[PDB]
Structure formats: structure tokens, C-alpha cells
Amino acid sequence: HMSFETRFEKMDNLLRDPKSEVNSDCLLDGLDALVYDLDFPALRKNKNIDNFLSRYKDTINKIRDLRMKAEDYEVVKVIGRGAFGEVQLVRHKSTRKVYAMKLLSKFEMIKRSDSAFFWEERDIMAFANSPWVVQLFYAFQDDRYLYMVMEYMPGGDLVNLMSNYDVPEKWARFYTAEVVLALDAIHSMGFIHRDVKPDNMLLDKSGHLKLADFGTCMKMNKEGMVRCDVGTPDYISPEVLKSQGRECDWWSVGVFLYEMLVGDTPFYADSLVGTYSKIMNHKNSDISKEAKNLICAFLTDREVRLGRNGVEEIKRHLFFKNDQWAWETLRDTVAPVVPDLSSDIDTSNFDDGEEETFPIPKAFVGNQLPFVGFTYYSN
Amino acid sequence: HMSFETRFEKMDNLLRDPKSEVNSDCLLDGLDALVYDLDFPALRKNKNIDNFLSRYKDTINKIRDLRMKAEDYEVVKVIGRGAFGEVQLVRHKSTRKVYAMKLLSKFEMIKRSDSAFFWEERDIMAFANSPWVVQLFYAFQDDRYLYMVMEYMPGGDLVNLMSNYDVPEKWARFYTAEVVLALDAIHSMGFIHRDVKPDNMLLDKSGHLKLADFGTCMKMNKEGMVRCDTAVGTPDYISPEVLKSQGGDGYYGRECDWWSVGVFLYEMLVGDTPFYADSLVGTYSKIMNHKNSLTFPDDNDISKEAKNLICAFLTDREVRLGRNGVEEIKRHLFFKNDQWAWETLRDTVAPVVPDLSSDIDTSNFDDLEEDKGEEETFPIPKAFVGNQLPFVGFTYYSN
Ligand SMILES: N[C@H]1CC[C@@H](C(=O)Nc2cc3cc[nH]c(=O)c3cc2Cl)CC1
Ligand SMILES: N[C@H]1CC[C@@H](C(=O)Nc2cc3cc[nH]c(=O)c3cc2Cl)CC1
């Protein structure tokens, strides 16, 4: 039993505790949402509602206007496209600061039952506080989209990179190993990524690596494993392809490595289903002895796969031997490729029908609800 | 503008501002409300809904627990009953402090279209900061009732008082004049009482006076008037103008309170309402006929002045006492004596002081009937009905 003077402080806590589902900004998100989901001709016909909307008209419009809205960002150039919206480079009008804003169509997010997945991604990007993980500075929302303002990566994706260069075993060793420190960072936070791939790997102005998408992430329980409900084709791990009715990330890894030295998927197939079964037959489906080894050590069945035991076990692998870097020093050494940037907005490492809207309801559908609590300020 | 920072210079404000319809508490009130009006089987079948109530399940239960709830209060004795709930003496378990907590059935308040009246009552009691206005410390709500925790008044209502004594012109002069200072106080907060009556007049441990219920209050416009199609008040103590109100002429100023007061005074010296009648309607028309309904049993125990003052309040608005200034009333001959001056009457020795056993002597509160069958509940909705929305923002905690 707490006391008065106590309970009050304790409550101010929550009203400030940004990990709280009911941080002040989340309550405001609630009032906001509610006013959205209510201001419709049909519904306003109700005493209670119309009275409400008539009382929080002025006030809530004031709010909308003050809080962060998309009108606050100048969009320099679209630099990417996810499933539910586009990622565009931006500069804050009032602050002049430059971020990368990922967009999310509330609609598309509802149409597909693919809702409530971005919570893990928000949390991670906003509190991982890690050199390995992209940092979220702001997250806000209107009627149409979610917005995630985040540390811009001038470096570009590992995809563009592998496109442009004849990757040597050196580089390979570098990028791979960093991906390993990062994935271990994630797992330390008690999450599993489930989608490891070049498309998700970005680079900071210094040519080092972070992880840039976390939609796939899933919280792993006490025993370190997960009850699972896929992700990608060219990479995916079989052991998790049967639970449908951790070390999996490591599989994805090996796949990537192969892709990097080779120039194509370790189980590429013109037909996709082909790539699928081909991964199921992994056992039977220029380079160094070690490269080969390592790869095939990851590319094995769950229980005999490389990394089943400890991450350290992976670190120590022979292919991870050199006279150019140590592990807890890698982050600070000279990247294999460093980006030459003309300004704070060089979209050079990023190469070059539409969308609809929700239908006016006849009754309360509350389409804003799955989104209350998404607003986050970093100060 | 200009820019980001000023935006915050309004933001942080809207959250501190206790008079803001969106003070932090208000926002918490919104989320709470929502959870209530949402957690029902039929509704839950909605993906958006279900997902919501599944994310704020834990959290919202936490909130409910911490914030002020009624389980925080030990209910000493029921000392009163209004229209929408009972009014009970209580002591805070954790703090052991003693208050009077008035309840309000959210149902009953919805049943009758009589909703959204309590906001003016709350604002006044919480911000009047006046010797004449009972003070609110805390206001909270659950699914069922609104609660208003407020300065307890061991003194008792002037109805009990008038009951137990042969009130003399002195006393009369006292109570009445304090009623005037107080009504003037409310008048200056730009409000009209509309319901002046002994029932609303309470006493503090020093035998001095305050007004105790403000449901009837209504904010008056720049010209000092208000306009009310269907008007309120109490059968006996009603002003006639307020009385003859409808779709049409229902507009009146503050001197209607002054009428109510004259009624008071009569009641106090005579022992019955100036227009009492066994049938109510009778009192009504009797009021309409005041010019010739006014009388006094030929017991010359009444003063020239008393009678005077009384009749000066009980006249038609336009020629009634106080139409001009409150000062005008203050100066009246019946308000002449060598025992108190206006700007000092609060500080003097009350005409009756309560002898109290403890900090909980409910001695000046006669016994009342408990459960009279009044506790009824909302019916489980088939669709979202939003019954808690009218009460978003009612929560307020004291500095
Ligand atoms: N994960 C898949 C879907 C998301 C997409 C994606 O999110 N791409 C990007 C993410 C970020 C993150 C932070 N900063 C950036 O500049 C940036 C740029 C792009 Cl293009 C990548 C493929
Ligand atoms: N408006 C009518 C119905 C309500 C009734 C009423 O509210 N009475 C009371 C008001 C208060 C107020 C503050 N403190 C108290 O202790 C207290 C006690 C009672 Cl019995 C008055 C007549």
C-alpha cells in the first residue's frame, strides 16, 4: 500500500515515463483519435457525441496545430519505399536539422490484418541507444499516416554497395562481423529480427553499419525461443518454416555472406517456390577455405548450425582472423568504404498506382484506435 | 511560431492550466472513459476496439488503481441527500483528514436530461477561494458516480437552525447580512444563484455562513443578465420572473436572488413561507399575486424595518430592492446596529456557535433514510453509446 504524497509522485512518473503506454503524449493521442473517429455526420447525430465534438472542436484543433505535424518537414527527396509507405529524406523547417522520415499508411496497415507490428520497431529504434541500431527521434501521426523521424544514414544500403563493387574477402569479413555485433545487440534486448538481409543494412557517414528496419522483430521469451506465426524469400530459415503449424537469424547471416562473395542467392531460382524448396534441401542444394566453411556452418539445420551455442562461438571462427581489427574495437576502425558526401543531404547512395483512404463510416468503427500511443518526442 | 519553441510555450501550458478543459487529469479522464464505454462483448468484436482494450488493459488498470477512488474514503455517516446522490461525511483513510463527499449518479444524471450542470458548481467551489463559498479539494469519478470532496461544515444548514430556535431580529439581521455578502461574492464571480434557500446555507465550526450547493448557478452575460427558457429554483423561494419562464421570455438578471432572500427573511421571522399553500400550484400563483398575497399574523413582535425590507425585496423586479446596487441594500435601515459593520462581520462572534464533541460530530444533521431504491445502472450497450463522455474532465486535484 502506497500513500498519498506518494501515489501522486508515482503518477507524475507515468505522466512522464515515456515507456508508459499512458505517457502524457499517449493520452493526447487518445483524445485526438477519438475526435477523428467521431466527427462524422451520421454519428454526430448523437447527443453525447455532438456535444463532445462541439466542446473539443476549438481545443483539439489548437492541439493538432501545435504538436508535430508533417507540415513541419520539407521533403528533399524520396529515398526508399516500404510495404505501407515511402521513406523520404527531410529537413526540419524550424530547426534546419536533417532526418529520414518513414511513412506508414494507416489504411493499408488496416486493410492487411498486418496491424500492431510497429510497436516493437518504435520501442527499439527509440531506446536501443546503440551504435548498431538506427535512432528514432520523433514519432507522430495524423488521420492518414504514422511518421517515424530518424537518424539519416548517408551511407546507403548494402544492396547498392554489393551492386557497385567487386567485394573482396576483406570487406566481406568486415560487414559480416559488424552485422554480427549488431544482431547480438538486438538479441541482448531480448528480440529476434527474423528478417536479416542487405536491404535492411545501412551505413553512417563513416561507412559503418546499423540496422534500419525492425518491423519483423519479435520478443523472445525466457527460454530464448519463440512460438511463431514469414519474412523474405532468398534468405529465410527452414527451422522456423515448420513451427507455423533465434539461430534462425544466423542462418539469414550465412545466406547474406554467400550473396556477397557470390553475386547471387545461395538458393536463387527463377520461380520463387523454387527458391523455397531449394532452401528446404539445403543439404544438397576465388573463394577461401574459411569463407566456404563458415557459410556451410551457418547454412545447416537448426540443431547443428553455427551459433547454436554462443555468439562468442561465432566470433572465434577461423574466417574471423585478421591483423586489422579486434571485436570490441571494430566500431572505431576504418570502414572498408567511406561515403564521399557533397553536403548534409547527398542522396547519392540511393538510386533514383498510388494510395486511397478509409470509407466514411455509418457507425463507430474506431479506425484510429490501433494507433493511440504512437506519439513520441525525444526532446 | 516562431517557432517550434513557442509551440511548446503553449503546449506545456495547456497541461499545467487547471482551468484548461485539457489539464493532464482531463486527458487521463478521456482514456479512462473510453476504456469504460468500450469494454463490452458486442463491441469487442471489432478488431480496432479489441486490439485497443488489449493494449491498455494492464496500463489502464494501473491508473484506476493509483488515482483517487472511493475506496480511499471511510464513510462515517450519511448527512444529506440531493437529487442525484447522497452527501456523506468521510475521513480519508491514508491522510485521516475529514471532508464532506457529495455523490452524483451518472445514470440518474443522464436519465433526466439534467446533465452538464455540475461544471459551474465545480469551477466555483474549486476556485472561489472565498470565506463565503464552500471549498472543493478533490473531484473524481468512476463508472458510476462523480465525486466532490469538500470543506465539511459541522455547523449544519439553516433549516435545522430555524427549526430549533425562536430566532430574534438580531440573529435574523446577522444571517441575512452574511447571505448578502456571500451572494454579492458570487455575483462578482459573474454568476447568478437562482436557488437561494436555507437548505443551501451551511455553517462552519465558528457558526458563520457559506453557500453549499451551486447546481443552480448560471454565468451572466456582459449586461448582467441571463436567458433561460426552462428555469430553475425552489417551489417557495422562487422569484416570479424566473418563474414565468418558457420558450419565450425566460431572461432575467441578478435581483431575482434578492427576491429569494426576502423570502428567506420572512421565513425566518414568521416560521412559514411568505406564500405557503398546501397545494403547490397554490404557492405558485400566490407568488404571482405577491402584490396582494403578502401578509403577517397580527403579532406586533415584528419591526417596522423587518416588514419594510421584506416588502422591498418582495416586489416586482423593476422596483425591487437591490435593482440598483448591492450597496443600496447594505444601507437599508434594518441593517443598522452597534454590534457589527459590513467589512468585519465575518470576523465577529456568530449568533450561534456549534459545540462539537470531535472533528466528526454529526449532531447538527438529523437522521435520514438510506437506500430508497435510487441506485440504478446503465444497460449494457449493443453499440457504442458513449455514456461517460459527458463527464470527461471532471477530475481535479488540489494544489
Ligand atoms: N526494411 C525494408 C522496408 C524498409 C526499407 C527502409 O526502411 N529503408 C530505409 C530506412 C532508413 C532508416 C533510417 N534512415 C534512413 O535514411 C533510411 C533509409 C531507407 Cl531507404 C528497407 C527495406
Ligand atoms: N442543494 C440541496 C440538496 C443538496 C443539499 C446539500 O448538498 N447539503 C449539504 C451540502 C454540503 C456542502 C459542503 N459541505 C457539507 O458538509 C455539506 C453538507 C450537506 Cl448536508 C443542500 C440542499
PDB file of N, CA, C and O in Angstrom, chain A residues 34 48 52 55-56, chain B residues 29-38 40 64 106-107 110 118-119 141-146 377-378 384-394:
ATOM      1  N   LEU A  34     -10.024   9.773 -30.849  1.00  0.00           N
ATOM      2  CA  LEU A  34     -11.442   9.839 -30.576  1.00  0.00           C
ATOM      3  C   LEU A  34     -12.138  10.928 -31.401  1.00  0.00           C
ATOM      4  O   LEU A  34     -13.109  10.651 -32.111  1.00  0.00           O
ATOM      5  N   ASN A  48     -24.662  12.774 -26.960  1.00  0.00           N
ATOM      6  CA  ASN A  48     -23.333  12.667 -26.348  1.00  0.00           C
ATOM      7  C   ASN A  48     -22.204  13.053 -27.294  1.00  0.00           C
ATOM      8  O   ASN A  48     -21.407  13.943 -26.998  1.00  0.00           O
ATOM      9  N   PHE A  52     -19.860  16.481 -27.249  1.00  0.00           N
ATOM     10  CA  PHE A  52     -18.418  16.279 -27.126  1.00  0.00           C
ATOM     11  C   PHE A  52     -17.667  17.024 -28.239  1.00  0.00           C
ATOM     12  O   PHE A  52     -16.910  17.937 -27.967  1.00  0.00           O
ATOM     13  N   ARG A  55     -17.548  20.592 -27.896  1.00  0.00           N
ATOM     14  CA  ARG A  55     -16.753  21.111 -26.787  1.00  0.00           C
ATOM     15  C   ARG A  55     -15.243  21.040 -27.055  1.00  0.00           C
ATOM     16  O   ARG A  55     -14.483  21.902 -26.609  1.00  0.00           O
ATOM     17  N   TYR A  56     -14.814  20.024 -27.796  1.00  0.00           N
ATOM     18  CA  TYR A  56     -13.398  19.824 -28.084  1.00  0.00           C
ATOM     19  C   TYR A  56     -13.061  20.195 -29.530  1.00  0.00           C
ATOM     20  O   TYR A  56     -12.005  19.833 -30.035  1.00  0.00           O
TER      21      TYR A  56
ATOM     22  N   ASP B  29      -8.789  11.302 -17.965  1.00  0.00           N
ATOM     23  CA  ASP B  29     -10.229  11.115 -17.855  1.00  0.00           C
ATOM     24  C   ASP B  29     -10.762  10.581 -19.169  1.00  0.00           C
ATOM     25  O   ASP B  29     -11.647   9.737 -19.191  1.00  0.00           O
ATOM     26  N   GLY B  30     -10.201  11.075 -20.264  1.00  0.00           N
ATOM     27  CA  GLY B  30     -10.610  10.655 -21.586  1.00  0.00           C
ATOM     28  C   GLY B  30     -10.277   9.201 -21.828  1.00  0.00           C
ATOM     29  O   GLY B  30     -11.132   8.420 -22.234  1.00  0.00           O
ATOM     30  N   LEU B  31      -9.027   8.825 -21.582  1.00  0.00           N
ATOM     31  CA  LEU B  31      -8.633   7.424 -21.761  1.00  0.00           C
ATOM     32  C   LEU B  31      -9.440   6.494 -20.871  1.00  0.00           C
ATOM     33  O   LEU B  31      -9.913   5.458 -21.293  1.00  0.00           O
ATOM     34  N   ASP B  32      -9.583   6.872 -19.620  1.00  0.00           N
ATOM     35  CA  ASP B  32     -10.368   6.092 -18.696  1.00  0.00           C
ATOM     36  C   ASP B  32     -11.736   5.853 -19.327  1.00  0.00           C
ATOM     37  O   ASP B  32     -12.110   4.708 -19.614  1.00  0.00           O
ATOM     38  N   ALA B  33     -12.455   6.956 -19.568  1.00  0.00           N
ATOM     39  CA  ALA B  33     -13.801   6.967 -20.158  1.00  0.00           C
ATOM     40  C   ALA B  33     -13.894   5.989 -21.303  1.00  0.00           C
ATOM     41  O   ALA B  33     -14.630   5.007 -21.252  1.00  0.00           O
ATOM     42  N   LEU B  34     -13.138   6.282 -22.349  1.00  0.00           N
ATOM     43  CA  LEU B  34     -13.027   5.396 -23.490  1.00  0.00           C
ATOM     44  C   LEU B  34     -12.989   3.907 -23.079  1.00  0.00           C
ATOM     45  O   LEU B  34     -13.805   3.106 -23.540  1.00  0.00           O
ATOM     46  N   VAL B  35     -12.067   3.532 -22.199  1.00  0.00           N
ATOM     47  CA  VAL B  35     -11.970   2.127 -21.791  1.00  0.00           C
ATOM     48  C   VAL B  35     -13.302   1.649 -21.278  1.00  0.00           C
ATOM     49  O   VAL B  35     -13.716   0.539 -21.570  1.00  0.00           O
ATOM     50  N   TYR B  36     -13.973   2.480 -20.493  1.00  0.00           N
ATOM     51  CA  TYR B  36     -15.263   2.077 -19.963  1.00  0.00           C
ATOM     52  C   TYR B  36     -16.248   1.812 -21.079  1.00  0.00           C
ATOM     53  O   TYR B  36     -16.683   0.685 -21.278  1.00  0.00           O
ATOM     54  N   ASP B  37     -16.594   2.857 -21.813  1.00  0.00           N
ATOM     55  CA  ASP B  37     -17.589   2.765 -22.870  1.00  0.00           C
ATOM     56  C   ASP B  37     -17.236   1.745 -23.954  1.00  0.00           C
ATOM     57  O   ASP B  37     -18.034   1.499 -24.867  1.00  0.00           O
ATOM     58  N   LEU B  38     -16.053   1.144 -23.852  1.00  0.00           N
ATOM     59  CA  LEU B  38     -15.585   0.217 -24.883  1.00  0.00           C
ATOM     60  C   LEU B  38     -15.614  -1.264 -24.494  1.00  0.00           C
ATOM     61  O   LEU B  38     -15.905  -2.125 -25.332  1.00  0.00           O
ATOM     62  N   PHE B  40     -17.063  -4.002 -23.749  1.00  0.00           N
ATOM     63  CA  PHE B  40     -18.284  -4.787 -23.738  1.00  0.00           C
ATOM     64  C   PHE B  40     -18.198  -5.819 -24.848  1.00  0.00           C
ATOM     65  O   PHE B  40     -17.696  -5.520 -25.932  1.00  0.00           O
ATOM     66  N   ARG B  64      -6.424   3.403 -12.874  1.00  0.00           N
ATOM     67  CA  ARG B  64      -7.571   3.273 -11.986  1.00  0.00           C
ATOM     68  C   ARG B  64      -7.130   3.065 -10.560  1.00  0.00           C
ATOM     69  O   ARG B  64      -7.615   3.734  -9.655  1.00  0.00           O
ATOM     70  N   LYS B 106     -24.159   9.052 -12.209  1.00  0.00           N
ATOM     71  CA  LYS B 106     -24.011   9.369 -13.615  1.00  0.00           C
ATOM     72  C   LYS B 106     -25.257   8.913 -14.387  1.00  0.00           C
ATOM     73  O   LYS B 106     -25.708   9.593 -15.325  1.00  0.00           O
ATOM     74  N   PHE B 107     -25.840   7.787 -13.975  1.00  0.00           N
ATOM     75  CA  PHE B 107     -27.093   7.347 -14.589  1.00  0.00           C
ATOM     76  C   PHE B 107     -28.185   8.389 -14.404  1.00  0.00           C
ATOM     77  O   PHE B 107     -28.492   9.109 -15.326  1.00  0.00           O
ATOM     78  N   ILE B 110     -28.098  11.218 -16.395  1.00  0.00           N
ATOM     79  CA  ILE B 110     -28.334  11.030 -17.817  1.00  0.00           C
ATOM     80  C   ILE B 110     -29.832  10.785 -18.094  1.00  0.00           C
ATOM     81  O   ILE B 110     -30.395  11.356 -19.033  1.00  0.00           O
ATOM     82  N   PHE B 118     -23.096  20.509 -13.578  1.00  0.00           N
ATOM     83  CA  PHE B 118     -22.168  20.408 -12.475  1.00  0.00           C
ATOM     84  C   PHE B 118     -20.846  21.101 -12.748  1.00  0.00           C
ATOM     85  O   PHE B 118     -20.055  21.274 -11.837  1.00  0.00           O
ATOM     86  N   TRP B 119     -20.582  21.479 -13.991  1.00  0.00           N
ATOM     87  CA  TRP B 119     -19.313  22.146 -14.292  1.00  0.00           C
ATOM     88  C   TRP B 119     -19.219  23.502 -13.613  1.00  0.00           C
ATOM     89  O   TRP B 119     -18.161  23.872 -13.117  1.00  0.00           O
ATOM     90  N   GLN B 141     -14.112  10.534 -10.341  1.00  0.00           N
ATOM     91  CA  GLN B 141     -15.235   9.803 -10.905  1.00  0.00           C
ATOM     92  C   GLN B 141     -14.894   8.331 -11.128  1.00  0.00           C
ATOM     93  O   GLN B 141     -13.744   7.992 -11.369  1.00  0.00           O
ATOM     94  N   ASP B 142     -15.889   7.456 -11.023  1.00  0.00           N
ATOM     95  CA  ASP B 142     -15.750   6.088 -11.514  1.00  0.00           C
ATOM     96  C   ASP B 142     -16.772   5.851 -12.609  1.00  0.00           C
ATOM     97  O   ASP B 142     -17.324   6.801 -13.168  1.00  0.00           O
ATOM     98  N   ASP B 143     -17.032   4.592 -12.918  1.00  0.00           N
ATOM     99  CA  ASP B 143     -18.014   4.280 -13.934  1.00  0.00           C
ATOM    100  C   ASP B 143     -19.388   4.786 -13.514  1.00  0.00           C
ATOM    101  O   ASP B 143     -20.184   5.202 -14.352  1.00  0.00           O
ATOM    102  N   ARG B 144     -19.641   4.788 -12.206  1.00  0.00           N
ATOM    103  CA  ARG B 144     -20.989   5.029 -11.671  1.00  0.00           C
ATOM    104  C   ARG B 144     -21.294   6.477 -11.247  1.00  0.00           C
ATOM    105  O   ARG B 144     -22.323   7.027 -11.637  1.00  0.00           O
ATOM    106  N   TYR B 145     -20.427   7.082 -10.434  1.00  0.00           N
ATOM    107  CA  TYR B 145     -20.700   8.416  -9.888  1.00  0.00           C
ATOM    108  C   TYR B 145     -19.587   9.444 -10.113  1.00  0.00           C
ATOM    109  O   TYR B 145     -18.436   9.091 -10.340  1.00  0.00           O
ATOM    110  N   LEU B 146     -19.953  10.723 -10.038  1.00  0.00           N
ATOM    111  CA  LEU B 146     -18.995  11.811  -9.889  1.00  0.00           C
ATOM    112  C   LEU B 146     -18.818  12.038  -8.395  1.00  0.00           C
ATOM    113  O   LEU B 146     -19.797  11.970  -7.644  1.00  0.00           O
ATOM    114  N   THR B 377     -28.561   1.310 -12.799  1.00  0.00           N
ATOM    115  CA  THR B 377     -27.383   1.274 -13.641  1.00  0.00           C
ATOM    116  C   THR B 377     -27.710   1.398 -15.128  1.00  0.00           C
ATOM    117  O   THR B 377     -28.824   1.091 -15.559  1.00  0.00           O
ATOM    118  N   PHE B 378     -26.735   1.864 -15.904  1.00  0.00           N
ATOM    119  CA  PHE B 378     -26.837   1.822 -17.356  1.00  0.00           C
ATOM    120  C   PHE B 378     -27.028   0.377 -17.832  1.00  0.00           C
ATOM    121  O   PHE B 378     -26.553  -0.572 -17.204  1.00  0.00           O
ATOM    122  N   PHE B 384     -21.646   1.214 -29.368  1.00  0.00           N
ATOM    123  CA  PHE B 384     -21.042   2.286 -28.593  1.00  0.00           C
ATOM    124  C   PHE B 384     -22.050   3.395 -28.326  1.00  0.00           C
ATOM    125  O   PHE B 384     -22.577   3.986 -29.256  1.00  0.00           O
ATOM    126  N   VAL B 385     -22.326   3.673 -27.054  1.00  0.00           N
ATOM    127  CA  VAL B 385     -23.274   4.725 -26.683  1.00  0.00           C
ATOM    128  C   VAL B 385     -22.573   5.925 -26.045  1.00  0.00           C
ATOM    129  O   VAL B 385     -23.132   7.015 -25.965  1.00  0.00           O
ATOM    130  N   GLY B 386     -21.355   5.700 -25.563  1.00  0.00           N
ATOM    131  CA  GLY B 386     -20.521   6.749 -25.006  1.00  0.00           C
ATOM    132  C   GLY B 386     -21.023   7.434 -23.751  1.00  0.00           C
ATOM    133  O   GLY B 386     -20.853   8.636 -23.618  1.00  0.00           O
ATOM    134  N   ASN B 387     -21.598   6.692 -22.810  1.00  0.00           N
ATOM    135  CA  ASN B 387     -22.214   7.343 -21.648  1.00  0.00           C
ATOM    136  C   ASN B 387     -21.270   8.060 -20.704  1.00  0.00           C
ATOM    137  O   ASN B 387     -21.735   8.725 -19.789  1.00  0.00           O
ATOM    138  N   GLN B 388     -19.961   7.916 -20.888  1.00  0.00           N
ATOM    139  CA  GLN B 388     -19.018   8.551 -19.961  1.00  0.00           C
ATOM    140  C   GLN B 388     -18.449   9.869 -20.500  1.00  0.00           C
ATOM    141  O   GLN B 388     -17.847  10.657 -19.759  1.00  0.00           O
ATOM    142  N   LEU B 389     -18.674  10.117 -21.785  1.00  0.00           N
ATOM    143  CA  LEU B 389     -18.200  11.338 -22.416  1.00  0.00           C
ATOM    144  C   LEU B 389     -18.690  12.628 -21.752  1.00  0.00           C
ATOM    145  O   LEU B 389     -17.957  13.618 -21.698  1.00  0.00           O
ATOM    146  N   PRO B 390     -19.938  12.644 -21.266  1.00  0.00           N
ATOM    147  CA  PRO B 390     -20.354  13.916 -20.669  1.00  0.00           C
ATOM    148  C   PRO B 390     -19.491  14.331 -19.464  1.00  0.00           C
ATOM    149  O   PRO B 390     -19.518  15.494 -19.051  1.00  0.00           O
ATOM    150  N   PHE B 391     -18.722  13.393 -18.914  1.00  0.00           N
ATOM    151  CA  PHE B 391     -18.007  13.651 -17.664  1.00  0.00           C
ATOM    152  C   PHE B 391     -16.494  13.675 -17.803  1.00  0.00           C
ATOM    153  O   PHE B 391     -15.768  13.690 -16.809  1.00  0.00           O
ATOM    154  N   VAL B 392     -16.019  13.699 -19.043  1.00  0.00           N
ATOM    155  CA  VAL B 392     -14.596  13.836 -19.290  1.00  0.00           C
ATOM    156  C   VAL B 392     -14.143  15.194 -18.821  1.00  0.00           C
ATOM    157  O   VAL B 392     -14.644  16.216 -19.264  1.00  0.00           O
ATOM    158  N   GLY B 393     -13.182  15.198 -17.910  1.00  0.00           N
ATOM    159  CA  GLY B 393     -12.590  16.427 -17.445  1.00  0.00           C
ATOM    160  C   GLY B 393     -13.062  16.788 -16.064  1.00  0.00           C
ATOM    161  O   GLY B 393     -12.681  17.798 -15.524  1.00  0.00           O
ATOM    162  N   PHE B 394     -13.892  15.958 -15.467  1.00  0.00           N
ATOM    163  CA  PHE B 394     -14.411  16.321 -14.159  1.00  0.00           C
ATOM    164  C   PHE B 394     -13.359  16.189 -13.048  1.00  0.00           C
ATOM    165  O   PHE B 394     -13.494  16.776 -11.968  1.00  0.00           O
TER     166      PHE B 394
END
